[PDB]
Structures are given as structure tokens and as C-alpha cells.
Amino acid sequence: KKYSIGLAIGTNSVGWAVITDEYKVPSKKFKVLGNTDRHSIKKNLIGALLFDSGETAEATRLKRTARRRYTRRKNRICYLQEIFSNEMAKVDDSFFHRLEESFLVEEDKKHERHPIFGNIVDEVAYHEKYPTIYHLRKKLVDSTDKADLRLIYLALAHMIKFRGHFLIEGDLNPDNSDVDKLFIQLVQTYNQLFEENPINASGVDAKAILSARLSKSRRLENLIAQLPGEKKNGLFGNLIALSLGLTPNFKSNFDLAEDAKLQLSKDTYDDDLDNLLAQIGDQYADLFLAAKNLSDAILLSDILRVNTEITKAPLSASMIKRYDEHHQDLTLLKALVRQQLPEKYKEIFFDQSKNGYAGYIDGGASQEEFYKFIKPILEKMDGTEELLVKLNREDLLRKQRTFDNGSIPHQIHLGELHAILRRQEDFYPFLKDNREKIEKILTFRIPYYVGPLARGNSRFAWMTRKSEETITPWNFEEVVDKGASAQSFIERMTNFDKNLPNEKVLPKHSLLYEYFTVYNELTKVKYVTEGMRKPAFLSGEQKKAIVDLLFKTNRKVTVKQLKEDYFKKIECFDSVEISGVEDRFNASLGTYHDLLKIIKDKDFLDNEENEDILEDIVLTLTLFEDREMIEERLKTYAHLFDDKVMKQLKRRRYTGWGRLSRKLINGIRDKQSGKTILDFLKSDGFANRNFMQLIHDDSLTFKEDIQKAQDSLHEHIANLAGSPAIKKGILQTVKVVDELVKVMGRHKPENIVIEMARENSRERMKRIEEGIKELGSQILKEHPVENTQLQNEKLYLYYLQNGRDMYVDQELDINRLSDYDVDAIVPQSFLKDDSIDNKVLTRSDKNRGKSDNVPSEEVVKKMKNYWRQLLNAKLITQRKFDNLTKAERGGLSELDKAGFIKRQLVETRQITKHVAQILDSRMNTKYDENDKLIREVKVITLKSKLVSDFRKDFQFYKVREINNYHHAHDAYLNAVVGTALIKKYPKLESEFVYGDEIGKATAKYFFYSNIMNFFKTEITLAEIRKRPLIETNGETGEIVWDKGRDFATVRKVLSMPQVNIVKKTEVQTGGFSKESILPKRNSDKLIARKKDWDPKKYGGFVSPTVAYSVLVVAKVEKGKSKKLKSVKELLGITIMERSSFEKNPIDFLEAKGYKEVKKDLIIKLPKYSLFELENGRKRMLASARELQKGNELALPSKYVNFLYLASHNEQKQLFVEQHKHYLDEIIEQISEFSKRVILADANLDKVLSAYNKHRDKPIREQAENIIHLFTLTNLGAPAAFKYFDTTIDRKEYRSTKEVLDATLIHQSITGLYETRIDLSQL
Template identity: 30%
Template sequence: MGIDLKLKQKLYEDLFCRYRKVTQKKLKKYLVIEGITDKNVEITGIDNDFKASLTAYHDFKEKLTDVHLSQNDKENIVLNIVLFGDDKKLLKRRLKKLYPDFTENQLKGLCSLNYSGWGRLSKTFLENIIIPAPETGEVWNIITALWETNENLNQLLSNKYTFMEEVNRYNEGEKKTDISYKTVEELYVSPAVKRQIWQTLKVVREICKVMGCEPKRVFIETAREKQESKRTESRKSRLIDLYKSCKNEERNWISELESWSDQQYRSDKLYLYYTQKGKCMYSGEEIHIEDLWDNTKYDIDHIYPQSKTIDDSLDNRVLVKKIENETKSDIYPVKQDIYEKRKDFWNSLLQGGFISKEKYNRLTRRDKFTEDELAGFIERQIVETRQSTKAVAEILKQALNDSKIIYVKAATVTRFRQDFEFIKVREMNDLHHAKDAYLNVIVGNTYFVKFTQNAVAYIKNDHERSYNLKKLFKSKYDIKRNGETAWKAGENGTIVTVKKVMDKNNILVTRKAYEVNGGLFDRQIMKKGKGQIPIKGSDGRLADIEKYGGYNKATGAYFMLIKSKDKKGKEIRTLEFIPVYLKKDLQIEDNAIQYLIQEKGLKEPEILLKKVKIDTLFKVDGFKMWLSGRTGGQVIFKGAIQLILEKNDVETLKKVLKFVQRKKENKNINLVSADKVTEENLLHLYDAFLDKLKNSIYNKRLSAQLKTLGEKRGNFIKLCIEDKCIVLGEILHLFQCQSGSANLKSIGGPGNAGILLMNNNITGCNRVSIINQSVTGIFEKEIDLLAL
């Protein structure tokens, strides 16, 4: 429970304003001396000691003991120290001019202070965003609200208060009518995110152009919550350590715990079984471990019901007899009779370290959920707090005046996928991005229509309103509001349309073509006589590679399409890379021609295309590929054909890749029955890959791999089941739309199969073209490179 407001203020004044460092020890001592609590008080909600230290407050109290300064004066001095603190003489002159009454010692003391950096929250945000206080109607800013309530910043920015409305109103007043990349540049996000936002804006604009109007709603998927770093100690080790302190017990827990592998402890049922000392959390009866995985006997129950909040953490789950779970239903708090009988057992688990304080509090709590808590549970599904995500939303609001921007949590969409068995395998193709976007619209729109964007109002305006977050999409009732139906219930309802759309694979996929910047070449200097680039071209001595060596592997910025003549005088067309370290000079056509003659040895070169960027889409004899780079006289591509498999093979592939990932983390693990991987399914997936190479577009560029997989099928069958999974993971690389190769050595094939290479001389191709796509791929233009 939180502390009393007056106590919070008193702690601030008596402890934080008195000591630079406030520790838990000092806090406990203070509470005991003041008679607020006894020595056995337990303090939660902080890790170790307090991070806040009020450094500037204490600095001024010590350095300017006899000087009265206003708050603005103090902030101005801090600002000057931040701006000019590196030059102490300049800082001293400025402070002396601003505050002529300061003594020499006072100036010296101030100049010894060091402050750097800028806070993430502006003075405008903290002090100038004003609302009327809910109870008194007095003027309230965020700083005042933090002092006069026990709310944190996120709570103050929730729908419970109107601060966020004022923030949005203030930002809208700063709107720009023209959205350019400069607008994006001003955002407080990383350069990589800025590029993504700009691409998003271009996609939105093109969609609006095609639609002929702005969309009614735009849905933004928000990333999963960042998990706090946790101990890497395995579940098995943790349990063994806990049970070592359990003495005088008849059961030999340690030998029993050691009999299970680390991999088997991945089962939450097994882990919960031992954290509960083998007993049902509600009845206290012994759980028979041989029946642990029999779902007709034992269940994992959620303490906070899933109908009210989606929380699958271990702190919210307990192992119980199925009949106990059915009896409990969605009731919270836990029934009084269960509480009375089991509270001592729960406390013993807490004291022994088997369960957390949070789980204990949830089990023992006697109060029902408050309206604010219920609203908070819903808001976690529809409200976003990340600044970078809000920055995207703000830009979209400026670009789309008539559209409503709505957040959708990634975890909510994941649960929808699981509920309706929409399998997602990221490594298989790029189409999952579009399908995720579609599901975000479906899920986000349903939540919006059901709860609006104000969960507080939804809960408080109608106390009788019922909802079930777990069964929101499997309820027998339609979800509608104000004449709009977002979700039609039942097997013949909206889910029919969703399944049809999810089965479609005619999805446009584009990549942003780009010019390479950055590193010019390998940093390691080669020995004399080796290398491609002189150590220093402007120095006559170091320019001699034969004597001093040089840099190797010049980084390519882009390619040029060149027409020239071969030794016999026949016209040829080649793709020639332009190195990053020369790209400025070669923008001048005469310089580029000289480079092509002298460095590339081309005869009568003519530039047909001045820039062919990385990730440009090529179509070579009907096979689409993205330009990736070069090696020697060859050009490297990555496939642009999206792999499509039957549903049963997708399921197998997902299981295979999960195991392969675990195998990388722990080489000693093997498949277990819980992985549900069979020899039959693995062979079926192998044959599906073989069929793709034989009877589809892949045959045009991967025919060599068809020969390998066909001839080595018998070798695959002889492998153990774990090695079969590893090989299938490698075969997948042949079909992925990325640079890479497959290691097929374990079935007798090559170690780098499937690299898409093509001679930079494209003259021998039957047809080779570049496809220039718009940002969405809706518009495109094909250029025949042999006809230019």
C-alpha cells in the first residue's frame, strides 16, 4: 500500500532536504523515531537505496549559506554552469556580472560545481501546463500535482486527469501545416527511428492518394514493454538453493529436483509445483506429480482474473486442482474460506522465498478492485506512454487532420493470434508485417468501439457494464457502439472475414533503395604489395601500395549501369560499383568516365544509369531479386520471392526454429515430447522444400540446390531428429529474402549453398530489368536494362 500524503511530504522535507543520500536504513530509523512504525517495518517499491539526491538543492544550501536567491535565480545559475562549466574563467565572469553581490568565495564555490546534460521534461511541461484541481478547482500544474497527490507522472497523464488533454492542446497550437523531413528531424528520437517515421509518412500519403481521402482511423502498434533485466540463474538452480534451507522434512526434495533437466523446468506447471512444495495453492492437498500434466486434474489459475486484466506473469499464476479452479471461477479476491485456511501456508512460502511479495499480496488481499484499478487494467491495452511512439502519433495527427490516432498493444494482437491459431513465423517471409498490420486494425478497432479511448469514463459512467478481456473476441455478443459494429460474434461472424484475409498472400513488399555511407574500406592495412586503396593518396610515398601496402575491400556506395566494348569490339553492359571514398568526385561525369577507363579497364564507356542503389529490385529472367552488393566480378543479390508453405508445414517449421534457437543457447539439449516434433512431419517439410525447388519459380535460380536436396534425401532420413531440425533450419536460408547461405554439409552438400550471384556483365541474360516501385509498391515502372 502507498504511504500517507502528509507522511510523503514530511519525508521529503525531513530526510531528502537534510541528507544528500537517503538510505533505507535512514528511512527506517526515521519512521521508528517518529513513532510511525516499529523496527520490523518492511519497505517495498524501491530497489536498495533511493536514486534521487537533490544534488543542486544541497549544493546551493552549502555554497550560498547567507544569500537569498529566488527559484529563477537558482535555475539561471544552474543553466550557466551547464552552458559554460567547461570554461571556469568565463563562468566566473558571467556569474559576477549577473550577481555582483556574490563574494569571491561564493563565486569560487559556484564555479566548482559541475552540472551537465538536459532533463527530458521541460519547464513548460512541468509548470506551464495548467488544469483546475479536481476537488478545489484551484490552478494546478504537474509539479504541484506531484506534490499534492500520491500519483506518479504516468498516473497524472492518464485519463483520470486532464493534463494530457492540455498537453495535446498546446502541441496542436504548435502544428505546422507542411510536413517535411525537417519536421521529423526535430523529433526526440534516434536517426534510425526518424527514417522509419519518414517512410511511414510517405506510405500514409500514398494510401490517402489512392483512397482519395484520409482514413477515418489510424492504428499504431506499440512495442512490447521492455522487461527489466533479471538474473540469468536457471529455474532449477534457484529451486535447489531454496530447498537447501528446508531442513527436517521427510521428502528428499534435492534429489528429486536434480532428477529434472533445465529444459523440463521450462514447463510452468513443473516450476509452480515446486514453488508450492507440491501442494494445491487453494486446497492445500498434495498434487500427484505423475498426473501433473493431466489437464482434467490440474490447472494453472490466474489470481487476478483474466476477464479483468491480461497478466500471465508467474506472480499472477498458481497451480491448483481443476475442481478448485472451476469453483473459484472469475471471483476476486480469493474466497474468504480459502484465505482463512491457506494464509499461513502462503506466508510460509513467502518467508522461504518460494513466492514473491506481489504474489502473496494478490492472494491475501481482501478488497475488491476499485474503479480506478479496473480502468487501469483496460488502459494498459489501449494507452501508450513511450515518447517515441507518441512522437509518431503527433506527426500523424499533423499530417492527417481528419483521422483519429489509436494505439494497439502488440501483446493484445499476439493473444488474438493465439486464440484463433494464426501462426506466425517471422523467419519464413516478410508477409507477417502486413498481416500484423491487418490484425492491429481488427483488434484496435474492436477495443476502441468497446471501451472508447477513455477507460475511466467507461467504468465510472456505468457500474453495471460487464466485460471480459480474455473472451472479448469469443463472446456470444456483438461488440458495437453508436450504430457501429466492430466485431460480429460467432463462428459465422467477423472471424470468417479475418480468416479469409489472413489466408491471402498477394501482399506488396517493398524495400527502400539506398546509397551506402559510412566506412570507406577495411580498417586493417594490408602488408606491402597488397591492398586496393593507398594509405594516403596525397602523400607520394604512402601512395605506393607496392612499398607500403594499402587498405582492402573498398565499400561500395552504389552501382552504375555502363555500356562499353569488349576486347573484340562487341557491345557489353556491366554493373560497376562506385566506392564510397570516391563517390563525391565521381558525381562529375567526366571524372566517372576516367575512373571507368583507368580503374575498371573499360573501353569507350557510356553511363546508361548513373545510380543503381542497394536494395534496388531486379527481375532477371523472371526471377525477382534485391541488389545486395558485390564480390570480385560478381554481383550479390537477395531473393525477393516470398516463401509460402501449407499450414501443417508452417506449424512444423515454427517448432523446428524454436528448437534450433534453444540449441544455439544450449548445445546439450534434445527434443522432448512437449516439443511435439515428429520424424514424419520433418520429412514432410523437407519434401515441401524440395517441391518448391522443383516446381516453382525458385527453380530458375536455385536449380543446383534442387540437385543437392534430391540426391541427399536419403542422408537426411538417416540423421537423428535433432540434426534433422538443424538441417531444415539451414535449408530455410535458401528461400529467405536476405543475404545468406545454407550449410548442407551434414547431408553431404556444400557449406555455403544458395548464395544468389550473377556476373556483373549482364549482356548474356535473356531479360534483365529494374523495377522502380513507389513506397507502397502500388505504382511501379519496369526498365529493360538491355534496351536502354
């Protein structure tokens, strides 16, 4: 009966309201179930559901993949030990047993406590000879004497267990030996090519300074310092930078207008270098060759700090170096500290809590914190200089297992492994027989395109089996079908053709697909000359000409190229106008030219008989990215081109998929024509019909063939694109609407109004680092920053703009930001954009020019080049750039302005439209005699601006900190305003409801900018106007608004004290506990990490999280007698024990000690369960041992508006000064509330005192802080707050005893239905 629903959808809330034809919210009586006094209770139909945020699947994913990593590493070790098992059984009966029981205490061990050899003397001997595992590694690599099998194992297992990364393909083979001759060779060739001016080797110690432990940049700087008359930006400088691993740019050297940047580790190096050499002349090739030849002996200089002539183990040897220098410098540091500051020796070398050397080795101090702690001790001392030198290089007292070993490629560890196996296979036959297996254990790696090696029980797996063997690293290629697996990896994610749903989409770089795009764009190009009377299409012949002559010879085709190279040359038109394209064609035959460069056979690419082949090739190049498998897939075409061409095709790789199928573009045929879609795009006579037209033209049969070709609420919502949080909001919104419908007797509403709320330091620091380094700027060396600092908006913009004004061509001052202006590129009055994309730092905003538009044309002229530099450094995005420059395109036209304004009130967000479609499809389910949908319910969607402006305009002020009522209030107001709008302007249905020259632009602007004026009585537009007291619609005359009564109605609704705020109860899920592993200590609070690892002996976890609490009434044994005592208490069931408890609850509880459990009184109490006690005082159950505040403080509207105005028109100021007494009154309110439900006496006293101490402060400040006070009374978890400078610590409630005798309240989603249980009765 005559009601509409208002809905405010948030990430943590859904406000809901029900309104009647005159904007009142009903008040109904609802039955109360349970064993309580109340049989019913009256409720207003307004409220809000609150809930914790929905989470992404990310954390779960990281955990799952980490899991798989651990189990596979374990299996690696197991494979190794299975190889060693028998021959180790002849040396040491129990070696592996001692290894796998090493973690146990002596009390629990089966065997002697010394793992390696099993006796004290031999193990002390071992650790004396090999203080680190790398000593053993190196000796086992270099030495030729037979070694103990157990040590061999320890070496191999250490290398397999920490095998390094896989970011470099192929193999490395360290050769640091000829860096001097290689540098001299580069200098040599360069001097051959530049006979005119040579560089002189000059005994420059290239080895020392390139293999130095600095960064590539500094090594460059220093190295080119030693070369006279040469600059780091010159040719040889850029070359050196290349040999180092940096990406330089060579265009300024070769007078090139096109960027030429080369990175020797990028897989595109061969073709970028071929590009460049084809531009500059191949006589330069031997230069870049030298760059590689050096780059190879120098690649790994940062890990291998040792001559490769002394060892085959440069890694283990460099680690031994770490150890020895650590030793020497430790002895020295000790001596020094003894001499000069002995009183500080203890703190440094004993106290583990201080971050000294003791804290460094035995405490929890990191190398960084240790260096930071001991830096002043060193530079203060004497005899220390080299230790500071080692400190700034981060090389002082290094361990061997360190955060920075992530640079080690697996090829190194593989080198040493191969070496050891080669040494000791001479003595152990089985090592020879199993050399390859072992190397494979270190080598093998499941390809990402295979996924888990599942067998029907992984929801995540997709791989397929060529055979039903158990899969090992040695039978992987024979048992796993890698081709089918790599196929499914992509085809399980790729879209099908929506027009032909049983057809797969073509590769985006398919030749056919690009012909389709080129022709689909070209077929709507029109042209005019002087003679003709109308613009005409291109004919089939003309299109084939434009394609064969321009598109198949130029990578990109410009309009100029079309006017000069076709129209002028082939049609003798000195002038012509082009209508269907701007500047240059968007589509292009990129793949045609890629394959032209590789295949060098244009007639092959033009031959239609090869179409299929070529498609299949580009499919392959797209589907797979493992070059080995691409080769396998291209073999069948190995006869069509020479070997080298096959070599180059291998490396050609494409990514991406289109939107349409091959059948669609060139498969389906028109019955009448016999022509495919592409046939029509190529030639369609006088009508040059589009893909869109072809697919919808009833004279052609494509559409009918397509139509011929053509689930639950929760899956549907989960399938949407968007934040899982807002999705949680959406589902909850649908369930709310369902309940309200039921509340209204299953009558559906007249309208449903929905509003959706809109909407990091490391990312920033990275942005600036890469953009600055690309920009060749020093501002980072000049002004060092730290991640967190860049949360400052103005500092971030300062760095994004290279410390420069964005509208003027002058520098900025880091020390003067407070004096500068942040300015919106397109002003805020049109685009409500707060992000960096629309903001700029400038000395003063006025120098942008006009305030009503894009930055003026002067500015564009003066700063355009600089903005381009920022774009190419990615320090601004394309959006920001185009917006900045729009004044050279007339800036903001009037139409664009009207556009922005209606975009401010009309919701265009896709996810919101999905919400509206869900609701519409749930509410409107019937079809009229003509099979058209009957739209009984109208779903309106509004942007936040309407209700916000409404609140400001009519002083229905909002303060979100006082309580949660504002969610509900917003929902109510959305219902009111939405229904009023649609009642007043029914045509605007098309704009706001779901379902199916320049002067007019100004009219739209003014119109949408004044749409909300039918609410006011007098309006000033910036002359005055006036409006009646009663607002109707003209055509119907129906009353839409009545300013005599309706505003007062709103005030009555906002003032209502009882508003149904419901915190959603939720079983907690996720981690069993905190992840930290604490040391052993006596406490039942420590949870075993494994069944048999008693934490009193081994330590364990703390803080398990309660999945849900349970009410238990039973008896407990008491004292030695074990006399049974009746109890009623709350037992937290932890996530880890939940499944056990649900399997059999009586056995679970009995094991916990409870006897004679009354099974029918067991009550599941998830987090946030609601309980009432005493004077309406409420608590929410956050845990089994802690409670949260459960009450809302309904502050009178007059105080809400007062606080709003005081915290921030002469009349309203007068109101503040006239009603200052409200302050004291407000506090009275709070005080009462607290003394009645918060029960935090001390904290309340500190509030009263701290306030009385600030009754002489400005009223603005006092109000702003009274607002702070409300977190003392807020619903939910207690929290700390500052009144002024008086920090009030939180007073939380950690008992939950009272709850057991309170009234439990089971709430509906709306809270309107309640079941109340008097727990006193149990």
C-alpha cells in the same frame, strides 16, 4: 471509397494492407511504364516494405573525434619542430626531412636512408647505446653531459606524441623512498589512538609487498597477514585498503548506522572525511592523514617499479627494467630449450605463424596468446620455475609499448620532459627561452566544454573568440573566451521554460526552485485531530513555521517529524492524521543545508536581500565544473565571506536543471493580487492552490500571460526520442500511407490501424564484478567466469544472486541449474516482462507461494534483508526490489490486475503515440463551424497481443522463416481486428483512437480479459456460453462480424500468392573499404593509403564498398591494336570515387577506359535493384559483382499451419498424424521453387539426400528442420543452414552478367507502380 489501412511498423519492415467494409483487400490494375511488353498489371493491395536498419550516430562520432585527435597530435609535433627549426638547421641540414620521409622506400627517398644521423655507422652506434627510446630518455634525464640536439628532440617528441592520460588533477612528483617510514608512521599514529591495543611494525616489509606487482586486494591480504590479531575488515585493514586506492567502508568499525566509504582519488574525499570525523571525533584525523601520506609515496607503484633515489626517470627506468629482464630470461629460455627440447626450438624462434617467440615478435601473436602458447612448454620443462612466476604476474617477456600502458598519467612524461629541458637548457639558450612553451605542448588540452576551435564552418562547434588571433596552446586563455564557451556548452542543450519559452530553466538545486518544490508539496498537506470536523489545509503562518522549524533544520522531513516536532510541540496535539504525504516529504532544501555547512551563517541564507547573490552562486556552481572558472566567477562575492569559505564554495558543485523559469516561479505577478506563483504557494487562504491550479485558474491572470508568452516531416521525425531504426520505420510508414491514399484516388481512409513491434556480455561481467566486490563475496574466485558465459540466463541470474536461492535462504549449485526454475516476480499472465528486472532464479518456483500474485509475505519476511544487500550491490535494481517486496503492501490489488490486463492490449508507448499523432495531423486538417477538428480519419493503435492471440485462436498461424508475407499479413489482420473492435465497442474509441469500488475493478479485469470474445461461437472461461453467428452493435445494429463469411475472407487473403514485398533500394554509405592495412603484394585490389603510396610498394586496403552500380554502354580498346569493341557492363562506383563520378560522369568513365559512352543510357542501380529473368526468376543487385535472391516462396496456407502445429488440442495432433504426407508435398514445393529460381543444384541435392536420410525421425523434428530448409529459398543474401547435422554451405551468385540482358524493375515504395526496362534492347 469505404476502405481502411492496416500498418505494422518494424525496425526492418513496414507491413501495409487495405481492407474494405467486409474485410476484403481490393485488387486493382496498375499501369506499367517502360519499354516492355506489359502495359499494366493487376496487384492486390497488401504488401510490406523491407529495409536495412537505421544506424545510430555513434560510430560516426567515434571516427570524427579520433580524427580530431590525430590532427591535433600532428600539430603538437609541428609546434615542437617549429621551436627546433633554426638551431637544428645548424646541426643537421635535413634531419626533419629524413624523419618525415622515413616511411618511404629507399627508391623514393630524397635523402640518406638512416633517419637520425644519416650514416650507417652512427645509427648502429645509436641503437647499440640506446636499444629502446627509454634508454635515451633515462640517460638524457640523469646525465649532465651536453647531448646531440637531434636526440634531445627525439626524446621530447616521443613524450609529446604519447603523453599519457589526464585523469588526475594537479601534479605528481614520485617519491617511493619513504614507504617504510610512512607505513611505520601510520602504525605509529594508530597505536597512539589505540594505546589499549597496538600493532607492531615487526619489520614487516611494507615497501616490498605494497609496491609489489599484484592488485591492491592481494597486497592488502598479504600485508594484514603479517599483522597478528588484525582483520582486513577491521579499522587498520580498511585504512590500508584506502591507502592503496580501493574504496572501503568504515561504518562497521565505528558502530555507525550510515555508510562511510572513502576513496582518496574521488573529489569528495575532504567532505566525506569531514562527515565521518564529525560523527566519530576529529582525534582520528591524523590517522587518515597518515593514510594519505603513505598513499602518495605508493600511488604509482604499479608503473614505477624502481627506486626514485637512482633516477628522475622512474618510468623510463622501469621500462629499461622490462627490457633487461626480457633479455636475461630470453637468453635463459633459449639455453633451456636447447638442452631439453631442441627439436621444438625452430617452431618457437623462427616460425612466425605459431604464436611462439617468433610469432610474438614478428608475427601477429599477442602477449596473452604467447603466454598461453608457451605456458605448457615452461611448466613441462626443468629450470623454469621463476619464468612461470614471471608469467602469472604477466611480467615474463614484456615489450615496452603494451596494451596496459593506459595507466601512465601525463604528469610522469611531464616529469621526464621537464628534467631533459632542465639538463640541456644549460647548453642551448633557445631551450631555456622556450622551456615553458614545450612543457605547455605536452600539458595543454582543449577543454571538453570548449569544443572544436572552429571558425564558422563546423556544424559541431560553439566556442567563442575573445580575439581573432590564430589559436595556439600558449595564447588559448587570451584568445578563447572560456567563460562564454563553457556557458554555451550547456545552454545550447538546456531546455527553455515551456510556459515562458523565452526564459531559461532554473538550476535544479537553485534555492528558489527548492522553495517552490517544498511549498508546492506542503500546500496540499491536510490534517485532522479529534476536535475538528473536516481535514484542513495549512495556512501561510503554519507553512512558514513548518519550513523555518523543520525544513531549515533537517535535511529530510518525515511525517513523524511533522507529527512530533510541529503538531505536538507547537499545537499540543497528542495525535493527528496527515493526508498529503507518505513517510516523508519528497521535496527538500538540500542546497540550503549545503550552504549552511559551507557558509556557517544561517542569518545570511534567511536574508532576502541576498537571494539574487545566492541564486547567482548556485547558477555558477551548476553552469561550470572547472573549479578555476568557478573561482573567477565567485570573486565578486569574495568580500562577503572569509577566504576559507570561498575555498569550500569552490568545490561545491551541482548538476541538473529544473523544468521552470525564475520568472514563472517568482516573476509573473497576478494583476489583482500582485502575488507571484510562489506567493500563492506560500499563502493562498482557504484554497491552497497548486502550481497546476495557479497555471489554469481563470480568476487569476497567470494563464493568459502564459498563452501570450507562447517543422518538416523529416526533421519532426528525427527530433523524436527513440531508436533511429524505429524512426526510419516511422518515416517509411508515413510515405506508405501517402502512396496508398494516392492509389485510392486521393480519398482518405475510414480508419488507419497501426501496430509497433516492441524492442552486452562485457556489461554483464562488469555488473557482477562490481556487485560481487562490493558484496565481499568469493564466488568469483570460487567459480571463475567469462563474459560470453553470462549470456546464459540461469548462470547470469545465479551470479546476480551471489550463488543463492532468491526465495529461500540457502545456497545454489552451479552444476544443478538445469534442475532449477526461472520465475517471473510478477507473473507473466499480468506483465509480459522477459528482462532480468522481472526474473529470478530459485530452486523451484513453487516456493514463491501463490501463483496468482507477487511473492508471498512469508518470502518477503525471510528474504527482504538479502534483497536489500543485492540492491546496495546494484545486483538488483529498485524496480525488481519493490516488485519483489510488494506483498508487504497487500501485493497485487484487484485494480492493479485489471490495470495490467488492459495495459496488455492498450498501447501506452510514447513513440507509438507520436506515430498516431503524425498520421492524425496529416489526415485530419479541417475545422467545423465551432473551430473544432473534424476527425474524418480515425487512427487506431493496437498491441501485438490482439493479432497474435487472434492467429492462435483461429489457426491463422504464422511462420516467419517461410517468407516475408507475415509482415503484410499482420498489417491486414491489424486492420480487420482494429476496425471490428471499434465497430463493436464505439465507446472504446477513447481507449484505442487518438485524440480528445473493488467490484468495478473485478468488472474491468473480466471485461478487458474477454474483450475479444465477440469473434467466437462458444467460449469456456476459466462455465460455457454461446454467441450468435452474426455480431452487430446494439445502439446502431450495424453488422460488425459475420462468422459465416468473414473468417473465410481472412483465409482467402492470407492464401493470396501475390503479395508486394519490396526491398528498399539504397545507395551504400560509410567507410571507403575495410580498415585493415595489408602488406605489399602485386594486385590491383590494393588501394593506396596516400596519393603517392603505390600499394605494390607500401600495401593498402582491400574490399571497397560499392555505393551504387551503373550501367555503361560504350566501346573498349582491345589488344595491341586498340580496336574498339562495343560493351554493355556493370561498373561498381565505390563510395570513395562516388563524388568524382558525380562531378563529371563522362570524364570519370573515360578515365576507366570506356570510349564513346552513351550518356543517356547511364542507369544508376543502387543496392537491391530488382531484375527479372526467365520463368519469373528474380535477382537483387547486392553489388556490381554479386546478386541476391529476388523471389518469395508463397507456401500454401495448409502447409504453413501444418508446419506450425508439427513444430510444436488432441485434435491438432490428430491433424498432424493424418496429414504427414504434407511433408513430402512441402519438399516438392521447395524443390520446384529451387529448380526454378534458386538454381543451386548441388545444394538442392544435399537437401533432398539429407531429408530422405531423416524420414524415420520424429515428425516434430522433421518439421522443425524443414523450417531450417527455407533459408535456401528466402529472399535476400544466401546463407548457410543445417538440415539436421548436414551443414549446407551458401551458394551465392557472383557474376551479374545475366542481369545486363534482363528486365529491370523500378518499384514504388508500395511496389504497386512499376517501370520495367528491357535491358536486352541496349
